[PDB]
CSV table of C-alpha atoms in Angstrom, one decimal:
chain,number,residue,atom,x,y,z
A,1,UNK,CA,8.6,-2.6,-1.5
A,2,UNK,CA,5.7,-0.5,-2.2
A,3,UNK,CA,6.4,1.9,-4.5
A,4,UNK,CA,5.4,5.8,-5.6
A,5,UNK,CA,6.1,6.9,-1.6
A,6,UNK,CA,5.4,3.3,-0.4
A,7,UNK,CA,2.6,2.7,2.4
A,8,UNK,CA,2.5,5.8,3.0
A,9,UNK,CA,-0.1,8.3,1.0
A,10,UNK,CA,-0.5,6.0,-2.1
A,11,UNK,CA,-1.0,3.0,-0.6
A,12,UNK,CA,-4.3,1.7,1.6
A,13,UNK,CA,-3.6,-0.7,5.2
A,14,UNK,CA,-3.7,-4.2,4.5
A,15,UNK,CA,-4.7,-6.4,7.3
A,16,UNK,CA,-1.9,-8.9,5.8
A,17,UNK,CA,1.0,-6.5,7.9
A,18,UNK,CA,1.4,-4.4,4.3
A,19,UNK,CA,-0.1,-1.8,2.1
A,20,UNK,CA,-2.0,-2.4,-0.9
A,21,UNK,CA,-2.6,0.1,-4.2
A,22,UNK,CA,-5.0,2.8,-4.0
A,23,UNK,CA,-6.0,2.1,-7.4
């Protein structure tokens, strides 16, 4: 699962139903 908080702040909405890196 995401990771550093996990979707939340840290990672950006991906239309695939998940959250992506905010680089």
């Amino acid at each position: 699962e995401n990771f550093a908080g996990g979707c939340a702040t840290g990672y950006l909405r991906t239309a695939d139903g998940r959250c992506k890196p905010t680089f």
